What we know:
It is classed as transferase. With about 375 residues, chain A is α/β, with parallel strands linked by helices.
Amino acid sequence: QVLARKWRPQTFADVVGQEHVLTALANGLSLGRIHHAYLFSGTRGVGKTSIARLLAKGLNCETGITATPCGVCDNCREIEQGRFVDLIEIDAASRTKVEDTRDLLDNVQYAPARGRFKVYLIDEVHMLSRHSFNALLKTLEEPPEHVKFLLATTDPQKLPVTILSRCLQFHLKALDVEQIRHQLEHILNEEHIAHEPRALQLLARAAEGSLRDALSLTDQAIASGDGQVSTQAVSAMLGTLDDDQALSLVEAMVEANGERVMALINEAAARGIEWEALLVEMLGLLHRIAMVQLSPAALGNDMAAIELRMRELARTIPPTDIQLYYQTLLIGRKELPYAPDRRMGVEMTLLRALAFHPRMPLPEP
Amino acid sequence: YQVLARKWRPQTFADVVGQEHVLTALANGLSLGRIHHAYLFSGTRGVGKTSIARLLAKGLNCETGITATPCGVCDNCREIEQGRFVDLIEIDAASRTKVEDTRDLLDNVQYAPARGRFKVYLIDEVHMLSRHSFNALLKTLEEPPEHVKFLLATTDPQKLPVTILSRCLQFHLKALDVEQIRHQLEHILNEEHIAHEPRALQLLARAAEGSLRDALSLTDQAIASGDGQVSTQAVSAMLGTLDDDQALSLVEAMVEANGERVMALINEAAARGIEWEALLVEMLGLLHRIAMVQLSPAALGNDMAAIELRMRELARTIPPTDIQLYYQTLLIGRKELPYAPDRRMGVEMTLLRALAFHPRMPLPEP
Amino acid sequence: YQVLARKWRPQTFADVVGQEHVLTALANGLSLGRIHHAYLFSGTRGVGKTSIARLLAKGLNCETGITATPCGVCDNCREIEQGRFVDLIEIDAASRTKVEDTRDLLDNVQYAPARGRFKVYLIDEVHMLSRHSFNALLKTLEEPPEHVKFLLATTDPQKLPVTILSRCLQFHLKALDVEQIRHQLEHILNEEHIAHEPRALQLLARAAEGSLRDALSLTDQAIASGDGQVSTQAVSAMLGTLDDDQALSLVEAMVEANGERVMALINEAAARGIEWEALLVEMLGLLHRIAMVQLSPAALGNDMAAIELRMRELARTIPPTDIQLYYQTLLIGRKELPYAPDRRMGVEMTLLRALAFHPRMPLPEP
Amino acid sequence: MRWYPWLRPDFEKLVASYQAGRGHHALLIQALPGMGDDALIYALSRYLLCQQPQGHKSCGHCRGCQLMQAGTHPDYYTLAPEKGKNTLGVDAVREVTEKLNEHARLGGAKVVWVTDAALLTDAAANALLKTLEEPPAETWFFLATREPERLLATLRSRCRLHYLAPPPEQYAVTWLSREVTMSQDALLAALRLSAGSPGAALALFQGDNWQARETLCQALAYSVPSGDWYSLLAALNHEQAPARLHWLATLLMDALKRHHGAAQVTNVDVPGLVAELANHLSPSRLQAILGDVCHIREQLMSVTGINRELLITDLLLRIEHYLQPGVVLPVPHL
Amino acid sequence: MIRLYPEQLRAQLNEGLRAAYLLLGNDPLLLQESQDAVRQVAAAQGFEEHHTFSIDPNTDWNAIFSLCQAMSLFASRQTLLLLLPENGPNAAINEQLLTLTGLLHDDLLLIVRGNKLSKAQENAAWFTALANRSVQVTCQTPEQAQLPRWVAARAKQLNLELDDAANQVLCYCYEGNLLALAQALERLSLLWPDGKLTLPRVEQAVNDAAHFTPFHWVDALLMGKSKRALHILQQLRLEGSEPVILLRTLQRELLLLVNLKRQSAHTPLRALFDKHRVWQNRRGMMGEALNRLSQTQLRQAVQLLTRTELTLKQDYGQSVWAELEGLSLLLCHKPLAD
Ligand SMILES: [Zn+2]
Ligand SMILES: [Zn+2]
Ligand SMILES: [Zn+2]
Ligand SMILES: [Zn+2]
């Protein structure tokens, strides 16, 4: 078992972060209001097709049409496995389909073999070849009772208004970092697998809003490192320094050490750091600090390693200033690719925070 | 079985909203028979460019004659409103896998119309046509047959060469006003006998930006997730945008300068899955309304009444100077947002700044 | 059945608008039998280049004789006007789809006309002819048959070589004065008994850049959208307007401090569908000029006239420090604009900032 | 395509794993331009494509070695981007995926190489992944990219990232003294002006570039003490304007660093310059100039066709106004 | 080598067509007319084939030989036109020309054309070779003193009574564009069939025609009052003049002022103008400009021109005209640091 497959949500109960979009489908199934076609939008990665399945699962089930599909019946097992007679799946991105959309949409008006509905899950509907496309519109304005359409697309804009108006389309949003972090944790706790705090952070942030990938990365961390989701392993796949460099840089910067700031930048450079990644860490550090200055409990989980240093800055540097550094660096990140070289970009910035330093570098003849 | 986006899909030129002068224009020509071989419809996506193009072809081929008032029953009218018509060739120049790209479908042009009077060619966003099939359109426009007519659409009229613009009767479809969509949504909901809260409609009216198609689509989601009611608590949540009280307390937290409360509202807010960008926006507008009210106490909107006592309090107690700073801090913070290490963080930092630079009391130091 | 642009095609030299010294020259030459082998007409796309060439071809061929005053009745005149005369051979190097291209048509140049005194070749955008055929025209001009005339016309005279410029008599056509076009629009409508508001014709005269041909088609469109009338509203439905613009009356209202008026102006402006950022440009471009009239009074412009007194009043009654202050406040508000929750909101708040940080009469607080 | 000396220590452990089994079927090498990124991939594949290897290298005779010296081989697959376009296709990938799905023609190992993975289509990324998930027994892969972050996190997780680090300066300079005779002082400058890449350093000299660079420092040395910065116009106004502006920037940086007492300097070539510069220009003035030079260099590279002359004349004259007492220099935006 | 003026050609051409005709000068009209006069006389003979080959310092010896083969293997009367380089023939060219010069004979008329050759370039083997067989026609734009004289000559043959003041008016407008002065005379003849081109008449038609050179904008923009420059600028959108072409006309004269104002105490204004080779009356006007524009004004005007230059190339359609108005205003009034 790999935690990518083993955690495919089986009920809306265990889906993560799409709150409304499920409140509308759970209510839809509960009361009995199921429309001719559902259009799911959102970027690749988000539960589009996953939540699509769970819909058909709540429709075909032997315990009735409920938002709570039994996970054991003969229908559910076959739905989740991805091998159901009535849940026909068509991927519009593939060039080698057996009987292309036109032939699978030919049988539309025919009865459902096992179940109340003959559901059609089409992924990337905007990629469909034209002659089959209109075939849907013959059915959409006058579709049989036994048929249902589950549509998915990375881009709605490439779907003609003829279809976007006949469907009840739902937009699935990305997930915040912490939202993914929190789920990963929960899975690793219940699964009894060794994990660290900074790891789950690095893992979540790496998966950009997709729990799907989040887990697939978590699985390669388990294979690459020890059977332990450790910071060492995680930053081994991704490529984070795994060093206190971002912090010491901040510490130097704020004392107006230049010599050491430029020094650190150099050593840093020698280990092939991703300059933007470095700036991001610094911004994140500058942020927690300001949080600590507001409510002293803000220093988190694996950040216990810094605690002392972090807090020392909190009590010694003016918040007014802490904002100033943050700002100056943020800006730096925007102009970063404007710079002739990414490193000189980083030097441009940090030297900048050193000068526009209260009680720092001054001019002369 | 009906989602408003389809049940109210304009059938007549009268049913369309607010773009009077482009409807009037097409009314004349469909009466006087002044048909141009090429009609260019420009404007943002969401505005009825394709939609209004249909009601033209719906009066061009209609069996009742070339009409500005098509009959919704004749076989031609029904088939047009359903996307499928023998002669109405709808080409999307933004698609990558068409059966035969525009150059192929334009090869036929010289051919006769099988059912309708005209062989209409609805093309969405022609400025994205392959340079190959673009010249084909040129060659057909310079000298087009009497039976063929074009209905061009575009999101950016400037990416179209002057050689084409000069050959079409151009029409700019403006984006509808907020309270022009709001007013529409209220009316439609009033006629469907569906409950609603006015501050929910404004959010839906803003949600779609001048795109009535989208407003309806947006209103159908809201219905499905609020179980029969278009309530602020069902809507505010789709957009991930705070109820004007959630948002209003944040603003108050900030102005009283109590930090814990702010981060607490932000955490409690994260729990219900916000759209961090939005939490900034609502706060800006809220700050905006308070600024107006200090000028003309009559400024507050109608559904604002729930928070009217609080909005009004800040208004008289907080110096406009200060209110300008909070609005600036929060905006600048919006500029930053994509560069912040994390969206949720950009928002926290933008706020911790307002706190550190608070005018009446700020974060202290030794 | 009649579109103004088509209905007012000039039928004689006598009625083309304002290109006097071109017309006289041609008309005198037409009376003294002095006609050169080839004439080049230049000017921006819009002026009547091709149109004057017609009347000259029309002059050289009228069955009455060679005249500066062709009767619009004989068959030659009627056909040349409809552009279907045997001998008025018209090419347009601009397109890529001509049946038989210039080279072929120019081949038979030495063939006497089938009708009328001269065989006139009218070629539009000669600077666009392919080199293959251009040289064909070059050879013909070196030794042109006395029965042929070349009426060439171009948008870009520079692009032509001396070889050709030295073998034609160039005639440049100046674009028309705005107050020249308006007077002509005013007249056409009157003779047509078509209703119109004085502001409306200006919003059109401005629109058509220097050319009547365009003004007419713009007005034809205006009619169809205003359904019969030519009202500022239907005309402002397509062409962005200036009377509704508080651009200077907003600044006045600003430095005068009566937010009441300042907002009333903005709502007014809003009802007209303004491009919010342009308004901030007009204000920033005005405040900058008022800054200039304070260091040198020679800062009053080619159309500053109506305004003159209004600007001149500000230039003396407003401190330069304060002018800088307002220039800055609007400058900042321009940058913040696209990030505001709503573009109108930005403007409204930007002014509220000027209003909050005003030198005299700033907002009060208890 | 020339085997450099610093490529050895890395090449050692990379075969040391292909001999003991520890070999990773997917390898992503990150390295600066001209660091021999080229030669390391190729040198590694020749070891795995040998029928009768002699220990650490091949024999030269065997079918592999021969068809290898002949380039054309049934197990070597070069995945260069589509000729003409600046990206790679989802097609090329699929056709090499299934190409490996069948037995190796010479009965042994199969190898794949990418020019730069950061240049492929997003769809091309995913299309590649599934194969690394279903690894055809005893096959080998070699990714390569200057920037591994601009690569899909899910993809860079399947491969083993290996940092091809620039060799110690003393070694890089000696190696360089051989390829071109120039003062070591210059040699080091080139090296530093290449982030340590000896290959790029070397290439810095091969045009008349260096001479063009010497022209710049002479002009600068006149202007710095004189104030007439507009004299650089001749030195900068040229098609090579951006590469030159960058040069002028490194000198600016250095002077800035010296104000903070930073030991390291890129332009060791002319310490006398960075000194005087830093002497006549406050750390603020320097900041100011550094930026305009920076943003202006970019408009030259990015915007389709501005006046190289006007822009620069403007940069120049503008630099001189920053130098005048009382002027309020600029601050970054957004 | 009968050295002669453009007017003298038609008479000589009557006696007998020579071996080679070199048309050396800068006037577009003069060169063309002389060229046309030669050929018109040749095609009358039997000169069917006509050729033109342009010599560059970049052209291959292989191109020279390839050409020779073309000319030498052709059996009948033909013509060849050598287009000399913009700078003039270099050390290498003198040879390639020399090789060509040995390709002549009665049935191969050579015509060379370029600007005036330097007394040095005139000693060159190729030139001295034709020096007994050929004719040289000096096509040079008539100098300030004879521009009026040329207009009077050209006008008199068009059967025109062109008054002296009028003549000057025509000269001060279109100064140097002989093609224009000729068209103008011909147009002016249609206007007044009369023939009598008096100052009042000519003045009215010249001003009425309203063609303004983008230079008149600058010429006005040189610290001359803005009214007329703003007028000309808004009258330059009525002749169909692109913005971009205006910016590079302003730039050229603006950067020129920058360098000159910079050289005060470097060299007295006098010699500097010669050095820059544009001082052609513009001198008093250029200096009048230099005298009231401060080192700093000149600078500010350079930033504006730059923004505009980018604004026009970054949004590629941001109504630069506005800025051109604003720019024309800076060159007349003292600016601030805002
Ligand atoms: Zn079940
Ligand atoms: Zn009908
Ligand atoms: Zn007649
Ligand atoms: Zn071997």
